[PDB]
Amino acid sequence: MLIRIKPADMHRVIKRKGQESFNFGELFAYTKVCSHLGCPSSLYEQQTYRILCPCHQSQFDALEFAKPIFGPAARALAQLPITIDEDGYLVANGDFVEPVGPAFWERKS
Amino acid sequence: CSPPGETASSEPGTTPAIWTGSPSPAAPSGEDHGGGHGAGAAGAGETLTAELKTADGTSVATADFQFADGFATVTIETTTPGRLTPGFHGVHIHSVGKCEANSVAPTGGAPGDFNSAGGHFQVSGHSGHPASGDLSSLQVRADGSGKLVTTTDAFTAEDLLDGAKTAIIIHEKADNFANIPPERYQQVNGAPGPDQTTMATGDAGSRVACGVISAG
Amino acid sequence: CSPPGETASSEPGTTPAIWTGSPSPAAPSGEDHGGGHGAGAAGAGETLTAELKTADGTSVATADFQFADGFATVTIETTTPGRLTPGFHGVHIHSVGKCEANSVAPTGGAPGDFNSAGGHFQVSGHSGHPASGDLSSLQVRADGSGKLVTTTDAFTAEDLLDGAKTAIIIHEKADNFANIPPERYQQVNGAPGPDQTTMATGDAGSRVACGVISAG
Amino acid sequence: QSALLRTGKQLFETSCVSCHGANLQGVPDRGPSLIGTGEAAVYFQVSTGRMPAMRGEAQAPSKPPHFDESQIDALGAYVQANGGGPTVPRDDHGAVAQESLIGGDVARGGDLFRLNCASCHNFTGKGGALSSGKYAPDLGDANPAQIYTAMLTGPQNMPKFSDRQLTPDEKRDIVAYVRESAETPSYGGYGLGGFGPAPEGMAMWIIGMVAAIGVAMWIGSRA
Amino acid sequence: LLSGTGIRAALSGITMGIPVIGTWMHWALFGGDFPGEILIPRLYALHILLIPGIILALIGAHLALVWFQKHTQFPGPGRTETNVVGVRVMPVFAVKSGAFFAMITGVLGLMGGLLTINPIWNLGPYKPSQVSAGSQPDFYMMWTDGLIRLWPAWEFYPFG
Amino acid sequence: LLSGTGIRAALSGITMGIPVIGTWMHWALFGGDFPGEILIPRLYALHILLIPG
Numbered sequence: 001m002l003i004r005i006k007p008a009d010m011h012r013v014i015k016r017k018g019q020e021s022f023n024f025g026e027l028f029a030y031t032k033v034c035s036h037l038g039c040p041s042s043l044y045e046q047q048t049y050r051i052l053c054p055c056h057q058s059q060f061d062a063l064e065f066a067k068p069i070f071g072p073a074a075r076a077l078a079q080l081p082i083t084i085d086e087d088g089y090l091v092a093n094g095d096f097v098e099p100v101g102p103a104f105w106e107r108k109s
Numbered sequence: 110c111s112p113p114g115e116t117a118s119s120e121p122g123t124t125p126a127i128w129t130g131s132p133s134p135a136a137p138s139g140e141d142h143g144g145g146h147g148a149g150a151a152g153a154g155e156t157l158t159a160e161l162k163t164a165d166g167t168s169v170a171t172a173d174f175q176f177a178d179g180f181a182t183v184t185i186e187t188t189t190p191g192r193l194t195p196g197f198h199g200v201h202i203h204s205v206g207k208c209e210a211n212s213v214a215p216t217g218g219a220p221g222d223f224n225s226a227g228g229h230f231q232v233s234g235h236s237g238h239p240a241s242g243d244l245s246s247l248q249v250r251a252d253g254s255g256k257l258v259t260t261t262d263a264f265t266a267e268d269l270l271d272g273a274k275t276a277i278i279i280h281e282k283a284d285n286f287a288n289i290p291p292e293r294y295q296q297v298n299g300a301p302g303p304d305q306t307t308m309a310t311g312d313a314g315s316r317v318a319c320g321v322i323s324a325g
Numbered sequence: 326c327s328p329p330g331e332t333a334s335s336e337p338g339t340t341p342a343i344w345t346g347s348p349s350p351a352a353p354s355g356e357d358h359g360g361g362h363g364a365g366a367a368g369a370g371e372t373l374t375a376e377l378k379t380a381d382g383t384s385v386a387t388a389d390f391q392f393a394d395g396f397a398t399v400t401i402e403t404t405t406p407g408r409l410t411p412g413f414h415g416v417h418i419h420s421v422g423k424c425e426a427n428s429v430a431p432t433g434g435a436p437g438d439f440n441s442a443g444g445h446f447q448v449s450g451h452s453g454h455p456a457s458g459d460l461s462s463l464q465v466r467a468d469g470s471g472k473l474v475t476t477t478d479a480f481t482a483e484d485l486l487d488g489a490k491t492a493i494i495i496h497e498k499a500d501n502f503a504n505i506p507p508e509r510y511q512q513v514n515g516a517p518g519p520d521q522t523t524m525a526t527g528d529a530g531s532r533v534a535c536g537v538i539s540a541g
Numbered sequence: 542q543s544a545l546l547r548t549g550k551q552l553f554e555t556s557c558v559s560c561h562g563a564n565l566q567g568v569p570d571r572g573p574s575l576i577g578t579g580e581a582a583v584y585f586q587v588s589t590g591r592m593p594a595m596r597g598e599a600q601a602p603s604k605p606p607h608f609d610e611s612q613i614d615a616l617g618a619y620v621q622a623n624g625g626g627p628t629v630p631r632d633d634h635g636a637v638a639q640e641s642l643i644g645g646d647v648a649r650g651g652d653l654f655r656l657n658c659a660s661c662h663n664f665t666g667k668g669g670a671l672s673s674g675k676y677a678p679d680l681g682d683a684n685p686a687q688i689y690t691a692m693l694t695g696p697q698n699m700p701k702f703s704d705r706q707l708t709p710d711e712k713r714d715i716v717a718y719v720r721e722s723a724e725t726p727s728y729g730g731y732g733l734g735g736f737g738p739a740p741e742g743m744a745m746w747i748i749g750m751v752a753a754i755g756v757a758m759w760i761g762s763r764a
Numbered sequence: 765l766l767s768g769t770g771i772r773a774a775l776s777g778i779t780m781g782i783p784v785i786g787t788w789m790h791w792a793l794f795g796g797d798f799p800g801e802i803l804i805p806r807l808y809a810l811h812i813l814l815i816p817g818i819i820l821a822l823i824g825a826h827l828a829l830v831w832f833q834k835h836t837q838f839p840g841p842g843r844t845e846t847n848v849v850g851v852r853v854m855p856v857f858a859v860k861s862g863a864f865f866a867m868i869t870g871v872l873g874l875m876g877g878l879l880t881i882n883p884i885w886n887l888g889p890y891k892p893s894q895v896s897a898g899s900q901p902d903f904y905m906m907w908t909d910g911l912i913r914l915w916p917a918w919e920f921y922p923f924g
Numbered sequence: 925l926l927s928g929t930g931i932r933a934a935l936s937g938i939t940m941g942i943p944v945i946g947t948w949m950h951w952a953l954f955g956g957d958f959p960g961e962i963l964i965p966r967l968y969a970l971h972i973l974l975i976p977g
C-alpha cells in the first residue's frame with residue numbers, strides 16, 4: 001500500500017532505524033500483509049493514519065513506522081523503499097530490510 | 110516483548126535519489142539491440158534521427174533515415190507549422206555535420222548554415238555526378254509541412270558513418286539542375302555548358318534549415 | 326444391415342476450384358486496419374505503393390507514399406541493381422499518373438515518359454514556386470540503388486487523391502533551381518533572370534523512370 | 542565418384558538384378574523400380590538388411606546387413622546416379638551422420654513422435670502390429686541415420702515423410718526422442734517390454750499371483 | 765494418452781452408441797461432449813470416495829456373512845454339514861492370517877519396486893489426435909476390450 | 925475471498941508461528957509457500973474421503 005501522508009501531518013512522522021530515507025517525500029510504501037498471520041491490512045484510515053487489518057482488528061500507526069498500536073499484531077509492517085526513476089514513475093529504491101510476511105521461528109536475526 | 114529493532118528519532122533522512130536501473134545481466138544473456146541493419150561501419154543500426162534547427166535555435170524540421178534491408182528508408186516531419194514558406198526548398202547532404210548558424214570551411218564568405226566542407230557530400234570514391242550528397246526536395250504549401258521520399262542510395266549505413274558527421278541542409282530553391290540545356294540557353298560568358306558550382310550541389314540563397322545526421 | 330449411402334462409382338468428379346474465402350461477416354467482423362490517415366478525400370489510407378518502370382517494361386524503382394500521422398511517411402527502393410547510373414536522378418511529381426513510355430499531353434514533342442500534364446504537379450491553389458510536384462535529386466552510385474527521403478508536404482493524402490492520378494517521374498538531372506544567380510550568371514538572351522521551364526519543374530533529358538502513385 | 546559408381550553397379554548386378562531388374566527398373570511382381578528412391582532409401586534398407594530379401598511375404602523383415610558401410614555407400618551412389626532422389630545425411634568428414642542427427646529439443650521430438658510415429662510403433666518406439674502380417678518394428682536397434690532415412694523414405698507401408706512435411710530439424714528432434722526413449726532406463730523397475738497393460742497383467746498373474754497362491758498353499762492345509 | 769484413449773473408446777463410444785438414451789448418458793456423464801471439463805473430477809470422486817465406499821460396505825457385508833454363516837469346508841474325516849473342523853481364531857488362525865497379510869503386502873511392495881507399472885511419463889498427455897498401437901485396458905477390462913475387438917461389426921439402421 | 929483469507933490467517937499464519945516445526949509444517953501441508961498449488965486438492969481429499977471416513 002502506497003499512502004500519501006498529508007503535508008500538514010508530515011511533521012508527526014517518526015521513522016524506523018534504516019528506514020528514515022525510505023519514504024519519497026510524502027509517499028510511504030508499507031506492505032499490505034499484516035505482520036500477524038499475514039492477512040492484508042488494507043483498511044487505511046486517513047486523518048488518523050491507521051492501517052487496520054480486518055482479519056483480527058490490528059491497527060498500525062502509519063505516521064510512525066507502521067508499528068502496531070492495537071490488536072494481536074506486535075511487529076511493524078515492512079516499509080518498502082520507494083523513489084522515482086527516469087520519467088518520474090514510482091519505483092522501489094531497494095528491498096524490504098526485513099522479511100515482510102507474518103513472523104515465524106527463523107526471524108529477527 | 111518488543112521486537113529488537115524499532116524507532117529512530119535522530120537521522121531525519123534524505124530524499125531518495127532518482128532511480129537509475131541497470132541493464133539485466135541475468136535475464137538478458139547479452140545487450141538488447143534495437144534496429145537491425147547491415148551497418149558496414151563502426152555501427153549505426155537501423156535507427157538514425159536528426160533535428161534541423163534555425164539560425165535562432167528554432168527547430169526547422171526533424172528528419173530520420175535508417176537502413177532496413179540494404180535500402181535506407183527516411184522521413185522528415187515539420188518541426189513548426191510555418192517552418193517553410195509557400196514555395197519550394199532544396200535539400201542537400203553536406204559532408205560537415207556541424208549544423209551551425211553560419212560557418213565557412215574554405216577561405217571566403219561564411220554563408221548561413223554553410224558548415225559543409227564543399228558541395229554535396231558525395232561518396233568517398235565518387236566526386237563527379239550528384240551522388241548521395243544531394244537529398245530530396247522539400248515543397249511547402251500554405252500549410253507549411255514536410256513529408257515526402259525519394260530513392261537516393263549512392264551511400265548506405267556504412268557510408269553514413271564517415272570520418273566526419275554529415276548533415277541535411279535545406280535552402281529555399283526548387284530542383285532544376287541546369288534545366289536550360291546548352292542547345293537553347295547560354296551562360297554568362299556565352300558558353301552553353303552549365304555552372305560547376307550549380308552542378309556540384311543544389312545552390313540557392315541563404316540556407317533555411319540544417320540538421321546533423323549523427324543521430325541528432 | 327449396411328450404411329444406406331455408399332458406393333457411387335459413377336460421376337468421376339471434377340477438380341475442386343480455387344477456394345475464394347469470403348470476408349468474415351459481422352459475426353467475426355474483426356479485421357486488420359488498413360492504415361490510419363487524415364484522408365481528406367474519398368479515402369486513400371496510410372498505405373500506397375507504386376512501381377516506376379522503364380521504357381522497356383522493366384521495373385526501375387518502387388516508391389511508397391502514404392500519410393501516417395498527418396504527414397506522408399514515404400520510402401523508395403530501387404527494384405533493380407542497375408536501374409540508375411552513377412549519378413543523381415531528379416525526382417518529380419507529375420499530375421498525370423499515366424506512366425506511359427512516351428506521351429505528350431499538349432500539342433508538341435512527346436518526350437519519353439513525358440505523360441505529365443505540365444511540369445511539377447503543384448497543389449490546386451498553388452501554381453507558383455516548386456510545390457509538392459517538385460522533387461530533388463536522388464543518387465544511385467555504382468551499386469545502383471536508391472533509398473533516401475526528405476520533407477515535401479505541400480500536399481497530403483487529400484491532395485494526392487485528386488481528379489487525375491499522379492505519378493513519380495525520375496529524369497537524369499540534379500536539383501539546383503538556377504544555382505547561378507542573376508548577379509553573375511546570364512541567360513541566352515542576356516537577361517539575368519532564370520528560365521520559367523527550369524523554375525516550374527526539374528527539366529532534364531529523356532525521362533529515366535515513371536510510376537503511377539495510384540496504388541500502382 | 543567413378544569407382545564408387547562402378548562398385549555399386551557390380552554389387553547391384555550380382556545382388557538384386559533378379560528382382561530390381563538391371564537398369565534399376567523393377568521386375569513386375571518381384572520388386573519395385575529403384576528410379577527415384579535415392580541414396581537414403583538404399584542406405585536405410587540395405588543397412589537394416591531388409592533388401593537382400595529371400596521371400597515375398599506380408600513384410601520384408603530386418604536382418605544382418607549383407608554389405609559393409611563402404612558397399613552400402615557404393616550401392617546408394619549407384620542408385621542415386623541411375624534414378625536421382627533423397628540422399629542420406631553426412632557429417633563434416635563425409636561419413637553418414639549419427640550424432641549430428643540428434644535434435645536438440647526432445648519434448649518437441651516426442652510430441653511429433655506421438656502425433657506421427659506412435660500412431661503405429663508405440664508410445665516409446667517398441668513395435669506395433671499392422672493389417673495382414675505386417676508390423677511396425679521396435680526402433681531401439683535403429684541408429685540416428687537409420688531413423689532419419691526411414692522417415693525420409695517410407696520403407697514399406699510406412700508414410701513417406703519428406704523434408705517439406707517434416708523439416709530436417711523436426712526429423713532430428715524425432716531422432717533424438719527415439720534414441721532417448723530407447724536408451725533411457727525404466728524408472729520404477731523392469732519395464733516389461735514397453736506395453737503397459739498386457740505385460741503388466743501377465744507379470745501380475747505369473748509373479749504376484751503364483752507367489753500368493755504358493756504362500757497360501759504353504760500356510761494352509763490341503764484337503 | 766493410453767488411458768484417455770481407453771476412455772474415448774469405451775466410456776464415450778459404447779455409452780453414446782446405446783440406442784434410446786446413449787447420447788443422453790454420454791452427455792450426463794461427461795457434462796457435454798467427450799473432452800468435457802468435468803470427466804476426471806467426476807471419476808476422481810467416484811474412484812476415491814463413491815465406488816470404494818460401496819466396495820468397503822459390500823466387503824463388510826461379505827465378511828460378516830462369512831463370519832456368522834460359518835465358513836463351509838471340504839468333506840473329510842470329522843467334517844460334516846453341522847460342524848466346522850479347523851483351528852480357532854485366536855491362537856493359530858489370527859496369527860497365520862496376519863502373517864499372510866504381511867507376506868502379501870511384501871509381494872506387492874517387491875513388485876512395486878522391481879517391476880514398472882504404467883509409465884505415464886512414457887505415455888504422453890492425452891490428445892485426441894495422438895494414439896499408440898497397444899491401446900489396451902488393465903487385464904480385468906481386457907475381456908470387455910477383446911469382446912469389442914472380436915464382435916463382427918454388425919450394425920443395424922432402423923428408420924432414420 | 926472470505927474462505928481464502930480465513931485459510932491464510934488460521935492455517936498458514938498459525939502454522940508458521942509454531943516454534944521448532946512451524947515452517948516445516950507449513951511447507952509440508954501446502955507443498956511450498958502459502959498459495960502452493962496443491963492446497964485445495966489436498967483439502968478436497970481430506971474433506972470428502974479422509975476426514976469423513
Ligand SMILES: CC(C)=CCC/C(C)=C/CC/C(C)=C/CC/C(C)=C/CC/C(C)=C/CC/C(C)=C/CC/C(C)=C/CC/C(C)=C/CC/C(C)=C/CC1=C(C)C(=O)c2ccccc2C1=O
Nearest residue numbers: 731732733734735736739740741742743744745747910914
Ligand atoms: C485372439 C487370439 C488369442 C489369437 C491367437 C493368438 C495366440 C495367443 C497365439 C499363440 C501364441 C504362440 C503360442 C506362438 C508361438 C507359435 C505357436 C502358435 C506355436 C504352437 C503352440 C503349441 C501347440 C506349442 C506346444 C506346447 C504349447 C502350447 C506351447 C505354448 C508356448 C507359449 C508362448 C506359452 C506361454 C503363453 C504366452 C506367453 C502367450 C503370449 C501371450 C501374452 C499376453 C504375453 C504377454 C507379454 C508380452 C506380449 C511381452 O512382450 C513382454 C515383454 C517383457 C516382459 C513380459 C512380457 C509379457 O508378459
Ligand SMILES: CC(C)=CCC/C(C)=C\CC/C(C)=C/CC/C(C)=C/CC/C(C)=C/CC/C(C)=C/CC/C(C)=C/CC/C(C)=C/CC/C(C)=C\CC1=C(C)C(=O)c2ccccc2C1=O
Nearest residue numbers: 826827828830831835858859860861862863865866867869
Ligand atoms: C513409500 C511408501 C509410502 C511405502 C508404504 C506403502 C503404503 C502407502 C502402504 C503400505 C505400508 C504398510 C503400513 C504395510 C503393512 C500393512 C499391514 C497392516 C500389515 C500387517 C501384517 C503384519 C505386520 C503381520 C506381523 C506378523 C504377526 C505377528 C501377525 C499376527 C498379529 C496380526 C498383525 C494380526 C492381523 C490380523 C488381520 C489381518 C486383521 C485384518 C482386519 C480385517 C480388515 C478383517 C479381519 C478378517 C480377516 C483377516 C479374514 O480373513 C476373514 C475371513 C472370513 C470372515 C471374516 C474375516 C475377517 O473379518
Ligand SMILES: CCCCCCCCCCCCCCCC(=O)O[C@H](COC(=O)CCCCCCC[C@@H](C)CCCCCCCCC)COP(=O)(O)O[C@H]1[C@H](O)[C@H](O)[C@H](O)[C@@H](O)[C@@H]1O
Nearest residue numbers: 679680681723724726727730731732743744747748878879
Ligand atoms: C520375480 C520378481 C522380479 C521381477 C523382474 C525384475 C527384473 C529387474 C531387472 C533389473 C532392474 C531394471 C532394469 C531395467 C532396464 C530394462 O528395461 O531391461 C531391459 C531388458 O529387456 C528385455 O529384453 C528382457 C530381458 C530378460 C530378463 C527379464 C525377464 C523377466 C520377465 C519374464 C518377468 C515378467 C513375467 C512374464 C512371464 C512370461 C511368461 C508368460 C506365460 C535391459 O535393456 P534392453 O534389453 O536393452 O531394453 C531394450 C531397450 O534398450 C530398447 O531400446 C527397446 O527398444 C527394447 O527392445 C528394450 O527391450
Ligand SMILES: CCCCCCCCCCCCCCCC(=O)O[C@H](COC(=O)CCCCCCC[C@@H](C)CCCCCCCCC)COP(=O)(O)O[C@H]1[C@H](O)[C@H](O)[C@H](O)[C@@H](O)[C@@H]1O
Nearest residue numbers: 781782783784785786787788789790791792793922923924
Ligand atoms: C443419464 C441419462 C439417462 C437418460 C435420461 C434422459 C433420456 C431422454 C430420452 C428422450 C428425449 C427425447 C429423444 C431425443 C433424441 C432421440 O432419441 O431421437 C428420437 C427417437 O425417436 C424415434 O423415432 C425412435 C423409434 C423408431 C425406431 C424403432 C427402433 C427400435 C430400437 C430402439 C430397438 C433397439 C433397442 C436395443 C437396446 C440395446 C441397449 C444396449 C445396452 C427422435 O428424435 P427427436 O425426439 O425429434 O430429437 C431430435 C434428434 O433426433 C435430432 O437428431 C436433433 O437434431 C434434434 O432435433 C432432437 O430434438
Ligand SMILES: CCCCCCCCCCCCCCCC(=O)O[C@H](COC(=O)CCCCCCC[C@@H](C)CCCCCCCCC)COP(=O)(O)O[C@H]1[C@H](O)[C@H](O)[C@H](O)[C@@H](O)[C@@H]1O
Nearest residue numbers: 105106107941942943944945946947948949950951952953
Ligand atoms: C510435518 C512437518 C513436521 C516437522 C518435521 C520436520 C522438522 C525438522 C526440524 C529440524 C530441521 C532443522 C531446523 C532448521 C530451521 C530452524 O528451526 O532453526 C534452527 C533452530 O535452532 C535453534 O537455535 C533454536 C534453539 C535456541 C532458542 C531456545 C528456544 C526455546 C523455544 C523453542 C521454547 C518455545 C517452544 C514452545 C512450543 C509451542 C508450541 C505451539 C503449539 C537454527 O537454524 P538452522 O538449523 O541453522 O537452519 C537455518 C535457518 O535458521 C535459517 O533461517 C535459514 O537461512 C537456513 O540457513 C537454515 O538452514
Ligand code: HEC
Nearest residue numbers: 589657658661676677680682683688691696697698699700
Ligand atoms: C504404420 C505407419 C508408420 C508410421 C506413421 C511411422 N512408421 Fe516407422 N515403420 C513402419 C513400418 C511398417 C516399418 C517397417 C518397414 C520395413 O521393415 O520395411 C517402419 C520402420 C521404421 C524404422 C526402422 C527400424 C528398424 O530397426 O528397421 C524406424 C527407426 C521407424 N520406422 C521410425 C519411425 C519414425 C522416426 C517415424 C516418424 C513419425 C515413423 N516411424 C512413422 C510404420 C510406420
Ligand code: FES
Nearest residue numbers: 034053055056058
Ligand atoms: S491477520 Fe492481521 S492482525 Fe491478525
